[PDB]
Design a protein around this ligand. Sequence first.
Ligand code: 48F
Ligand code: 48F
Ligand code: 48F
Ligand code: 48F
Ligand code: 48F
Ligand code: 48F
Lengths: 255, 260, 256, 262, 262, 256
Amino acid sequence: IKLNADETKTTKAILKASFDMWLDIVEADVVIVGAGPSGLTCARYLAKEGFKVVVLERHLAFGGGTWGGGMGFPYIVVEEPADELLREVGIKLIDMGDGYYVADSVEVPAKLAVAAMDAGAKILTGIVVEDLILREDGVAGVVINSYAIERAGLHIDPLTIRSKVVVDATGHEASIVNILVKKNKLEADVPGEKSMWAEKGENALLRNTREVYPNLFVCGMAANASHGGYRMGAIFGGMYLSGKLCAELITEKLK
Amino acid sequence: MNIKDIKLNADETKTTKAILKASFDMWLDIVEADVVIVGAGPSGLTCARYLAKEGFKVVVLERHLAFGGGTWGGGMGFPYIVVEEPADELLREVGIKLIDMGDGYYVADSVEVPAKLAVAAMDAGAKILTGIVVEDLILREDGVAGVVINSYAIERAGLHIDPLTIRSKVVVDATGHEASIVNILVKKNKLEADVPGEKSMWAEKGENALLRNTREVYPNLFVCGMAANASHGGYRMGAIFGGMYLSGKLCAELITEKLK
Amino acid sequence: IKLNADETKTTKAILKASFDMWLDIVEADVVIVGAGPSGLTCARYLAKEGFKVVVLERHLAFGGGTWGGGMGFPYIVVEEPADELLREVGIKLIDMGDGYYVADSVEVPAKLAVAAMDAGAKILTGIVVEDLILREDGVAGVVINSYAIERAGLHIDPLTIRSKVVVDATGHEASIVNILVKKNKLEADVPGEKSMWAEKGENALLRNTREVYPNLFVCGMAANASHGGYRMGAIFGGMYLSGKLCAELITEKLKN
Amino acid sequence: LMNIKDIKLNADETKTTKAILKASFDMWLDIVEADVVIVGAGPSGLTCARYLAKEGFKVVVLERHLAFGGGTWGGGMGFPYIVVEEPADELLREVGIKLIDMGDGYYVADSVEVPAKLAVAAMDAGAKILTGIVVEDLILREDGVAGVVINSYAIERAGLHIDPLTIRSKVVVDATGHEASIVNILVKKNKLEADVPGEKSMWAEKGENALLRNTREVYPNLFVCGMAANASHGGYRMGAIFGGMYLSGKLCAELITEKLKN
Amino acid sequence: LMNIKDIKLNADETKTTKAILKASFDMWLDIVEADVVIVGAGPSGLTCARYLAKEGFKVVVLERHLAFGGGTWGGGMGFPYIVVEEPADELLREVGIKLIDMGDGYYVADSVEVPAKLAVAAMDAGAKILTGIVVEDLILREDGVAGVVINSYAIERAGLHIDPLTIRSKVVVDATGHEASIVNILVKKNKLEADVPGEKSMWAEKGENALLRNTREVYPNLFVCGMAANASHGGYRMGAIFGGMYLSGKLCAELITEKLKN
Amino acid sequence: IKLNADETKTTKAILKASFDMWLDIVEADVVIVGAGPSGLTCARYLAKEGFKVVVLERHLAFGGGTWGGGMGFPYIVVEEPADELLREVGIKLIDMGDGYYVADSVEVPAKLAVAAMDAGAKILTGIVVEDLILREDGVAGVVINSYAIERAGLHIDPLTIRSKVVVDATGHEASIVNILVKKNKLEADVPGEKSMWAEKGENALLRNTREVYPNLFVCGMAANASHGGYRMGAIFGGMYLSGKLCAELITEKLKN
Ligand SMILES: Nc1ncnc2c1ncn2[C@@H]1O[C@H](COP(=O)(O)OP(=O)(O)OC[C@@H](O)[C@@H](O)C(=O)CO)[C@@H](O)[C@H]1O
Ligand SMILES: Nc1ncnc2c1ncn2[C@@H]1O[C@H](COP(=O)(O)OP(=O)(O)OC[C@@H](O)[C@@H](O)C(=O)CO)[C@@H](O)[C@H]1O
Ligand SMILES: Nc1ncnc2c1ncn2[C@@H]1O[C@H](COP(=O)(O)OP(=O)(O)OC[C@@H](O)[C@@H](O)C(=O)CO)[C@@H](O)[C@H]1O
Ligand SMILES: Nc1ncnc2c1ncn2[C@@H]1O[C@H](COP(=O)(O)OP(=O)(O)OC[C@@H](O)[C@@H](O)C(=O)CO)[C@@H](O)[C@H]1O
Ligand SMILES: Nc1ncnc2c1ncn2[C@@H]1O[C@H](COP(=O)(O)OP(=O)(O)OC[C@@H](O)[C@@H](O)C(=O)CO)[C@@H](O)[C@H]1O
Ligand SMILES: Nc1ncnc2c1ncn2[C@@H]1O[C@H](COP(=O)(O)OP(=O)(O)OC[C@@H](O)[C@@H](O)C(=O)CO)[C@@H](O)[C@H]1O
């Protein structure tokens, strides 16, 4: 095989493509912060509904804290009936009894990401949300920068993405909600997660998945961190449901 | 039934035991395999796809917690990678959307690619283990007999802890420009041979050498992707991946032949 | 000598045994956090009593802050009558007068660990307790991860060990009691150790060794740190007695 | 016969501090001359130390880390069991270590139990173990190696420029694992024409069996055992199987006993 | 006599090692009880130490770094001179330090000469200086402060979990500079209802004069001098001018002498 | 007491005096690199002889590796007859027998430094020698920078000090001799110190203290490092004698 490869043609193709993408993407319907299990589920459902969705993830790879499974052991758990949310995306499960299923902790994030992308959602990695955009209305988008710039420690201004809604799906950090409260000196505490009580934790998640400030929703562990809910460890049924519920709430508000 | 109105039954011990139990059946099974591929990059995952379709038992080992290698960042952070005719079929094959940029050049979302390559590999039967470092090789008189493994966490943490092993009929170095498995072989076993490393950039010379350079370099040890060019002093090509995909496929064909 | 050694047989033996240990260990009667002198003493006494005991230690080696003795000088001190707690485990002592004895600071942790293990206690090193498990009842176990993962800085979920009781034997850090208070936003301060007053410190230890929250006990310096007690330096009599007392208190609560 | 909570304990800062000083001071003045210095409190070094001390020699084991044990604790990739094969399993049994039979002459042992019990055996046999102590160099005479140059691990980690002290000995043993760090010091600093090749890749059988052949006096008064032996002679490695380590240590003690009773 | 090159020197490892060990132990066993402990071998602490030792007290100065001197060496922003103003210049002259007159009662001195000569004066007056030694805590009695809890700088930097030793004293002096680290320990660990405010911004005149007022016993048996005094009382700072530092140290010695001859 | 202290007057005095020192110091007779025991002894003797001497030291404090004594134990050893080199500077010694004396490891560097400074030598600390100055003649001085700049990792050009002679007294590093050889691609190896043999080591020091390249002398451990000599540990007699000898050799070469 003769392959025709040229530096300039390669460079320009990347540049050209990246530009059409960037100019288009800086206005969107929904921005999801965090490409974890809850954020990617939310993204799936919103995109199926025809919304223009961007998922932003600080690390170069999506996935959040799924890859390592439980203490390095590469399986994660899902309980009935949230297992359907995995089946529905082609993820193979193993039945371990009593409504408990496991899945390869590398297979899960891959297939959740593909579902999201194939549903229409855009995922940008290597991108840090450092702040929010505000209007009198409430939250109006996100202020973004490059992970590389952040790690490198450089003093460089950001860019923006305007959106109708922002979703904090950043895990136990609840880092977008914290930014809102700290920088805008709101009289409210983000308490953070309590200790482990899997049952209390999993069930609180759905109650705690809501709009916490105008145009700002939380899902996944960010929801329990924001409302002082218990944690559940390497069981993900509530994560997936929270993401879906979050998409339903947003769909309602936005139609 | 309403999604707000769901009772979830979640228990710490049941969760912990399920993960332990499943990890064990996996581990006890996986430590003997037909082929071990080192590196979950574009070449290694392509190779894994083809070998698994052929019914071989394949393990891909990757140091980082996420697969993908150096695809995610695309070109200098700009999140698209290039593929040239006819290697674009190797992407289409796997559901990856391409944009035609002219002259047989296509781009693809640099996040979409590694995801879809990984899914293909896994759906073809290949097992991918991340967070796992190959620190050494296993030898027999025959030649290479498998890999010596440890955890990334242990490595980063700097702890002095012994490894485990995976025996295989074949090992593939798909570790990129590092060519780290070939280097280990040469350095530790004091072989009279130099791993020269990649030359400077000449995309055309580089892309075409890749296929010539994708071969068995020592008994039971194959190289593909940039590891092939690094091992043979070939030029590099930058963020164009047609040769990577073809190298991976070729590497699978060579191994299939040897192993049938 | 011809030795028959094989990679796969070696690997599978390790995996098989570990896998068996793990499935069994994630439910236990008592979890002791910290393989220091107090935690290992507690572990000895509870295991003699037939309880199923796991000691968890973040570092790969047990021992806590015994090894370096005093400012690097490799001897630690024990005072009458706590010296019996060392002799009973085979530790050689040197009489320095006035009811003071010293012991080789390397010999001590080794022999405390052996006693615990031989009494039935299991010691897992390289393991960090990052959180607690709760029920309405009170503390229900511990949330664990690997030291390697922690040092490496990786974002990886934990596993669990359920237990009837948890013991904070983590030294002056009192890190388990702190986790409880901080994360569950309890209205209470963990004051931390006061300055050195060896006599006040040694004697307070026994008063301070107790159940501080349902199913959570403290012993060793964690006890004084939790109750704002004085410290005593490289003298360990109270540490050993605290561990023993802590085992007695737990035995009482748990035998039924 | 009382509530433990009531016991009156007499504890005093000065008495505590002086007891530690006094005892360390006696220990140090005595220890700086010895028959054998073993560098590395790993499985091979501690085994060696057991056997030499039983024989009545004055033995010091030096270990850089605060805890003894070497790379035993983490077992295999974190999984806390190590393997031993027939007949080296007796070297564990004899020290009270419980073994589980896994078949085909393979036994496992709790990776935390092993180093503890090896250390206790050594100490109870008479050996002295000093942790937190780095060997940074050797002492020489025309005769050959004459002891070790020592410093504190704390000082080393802290990066401070501080002179060392010494321990004179008739023999030195490099039991420092794959580093073979004492042999390397000898060669590098004294510009000897010889290469320390380092370990080859894994071949457990070739590796385990070479260990016994490779356990020897490599330079006058300097022995190697454990992985240091295979590293020094370009031998293969064997992973988390320790039968050869234990035998190497024992063999090393036999070779030294022979040389020194002469 | 001869060309130096031909001198026969008798040097032996063991004799060297045992001499150091022997002398250190006599020193350590003696030093762990003292009249006064000064924390910080800076300009104020070393001055204080001079005056207390001249008075016949048994004084130990403890310094974390291997070298004494505090923040004198670098002078002002690296420029190696420090300033002293009339009449505190006599406190330098009296110790042999050469001064250059810059006018208006301002003198400079070589920033390397000063710490050296202050240290020599202290040592020659009888004071003992131990470097490489960190004070991590205080010793208490109902009476008040009863000494210091000490550890090795090496151990601290290395990050090791190792217990300390102690030095009992009638008085402790915090001469640790703007950190006021001993006073802070007292307050933080013993949960005293009092704030250590720390130094204010620069106002050299207000700062220099407050120092003498602020040099006092702040808790029973605990004195402050030097910048620790201003840090403890929220006083202004003065920069690279040291007259008040020297006077503070001297005043501190006078206050202590008074208390202790009672 | 009313003290008159002013920021500007303070700042200007420091600046004024420093600039005067700097403009004068950048030409000197002898530059000694390393304020250790050998370098400071050499400096004493050269300055007594009327030469203009600068000692340069990277760390903010002088002293080299004296302060910590032996493995932290704060005493260093000196053997007959080199003990006179310490008594002559006011250092108190303790007789430990057989011609061995010890001295407080903090007292020694202080008093060596004072002697040097009082003899006329200038000591500049916080100053790194990063390179040499050359002429056809041979070595012509040193290229200097600030320790702070080096540690901070900043890319900043240096300044210079011209001298008739340069002395490498940088200890076992022998860092100035190494710079010469590496950067100027001389066909010669700096072997570095051998292992410990105190007697061989101490005696070789005097033979090894010499001019190794035109205008470049070595003393102290740098001498043994340069010539592959054995080391001797915390015994300093040879260090002191090496420094003195080095001053004698330089005096001879330089008096005319
Ligand atoms: N400011 C930010 N900008 C961009 N990405 C961010 C930012 N902050 C966090 N992230 C990224 O957001 C993602 C969060 O994924 P993560 O997986 O932590 O969130 P989740 O979807 O709620 O699931 C939590 C579970 O993994 C597990 O912990 C659990 O069940 C609790 O016991 C991760 O991939 C982060 O790197
Ligand atoms: N010892 C090891 N153990 C496990 N994984 C390893 C080891 N060494 C390397 N890897 C892993 O190997 C993976 C794949 O590497 P990588 O993605 O570099 O290899 P590739 O498939 O040939 O692709 C090369 C292109 O990305 C690009 O560079 C190019 O076109 C040349 O100009 C990366 O994800 C590494 O983390
Ligand atoms: N979160 C955690 N998970 C696991 N291990 C932990 C955790 N936190 C601490 N540890 C481990 O707990 C152990 C504490 O042992 P440590 O020896 O500090 O505790 P102790 O038994 O009360 O004895 C204290 C004395 O050493 C000394 O301080 C004294 O006499 C007072 O002046 C050490 O070995 C830690 O590594
Ligand atoms: N210069 C030094 N001074 C003091 N201790 C030292 C020095 N250099 C190394 N050590 C210490 O020496 C000890 C060596 O113990 P290590 O366990 O490495 O040596 P070993 O006895 O031969 O056993 C090797 C096995 O762990 C395993 O790896 C195997 O079977 C091969 O695949 C460790 O505890 C080091 O910290
Ligand atoms: N816990 C501790 N243990 C031992 N030494 C300590 C401790 N904490 C601090 N030190 C040491 O104490 C010494 C304090 O010396 P320092 O020089 O800081 O104190 P000073 O005597 O008041 O003089 C201050 C002036 O240098 C100057 O800055 C000024 O005029 C204000 O603008 C320094 O050498 C520290 O390293
Ligand atoms: N490039 C440089 N620029 C400036 N200073 C330097 C440079 N390189 C080294 N130094 C400084 O030079 C000084 C060397 O003093 P050092 O004390 O190492 O040298 P010495 O005077 O020969 O005495 C050696 C003994 O301490 C010890 O080694 C021994 O007897 C064991 O065999 C130290 O104070 C360094 O900081």
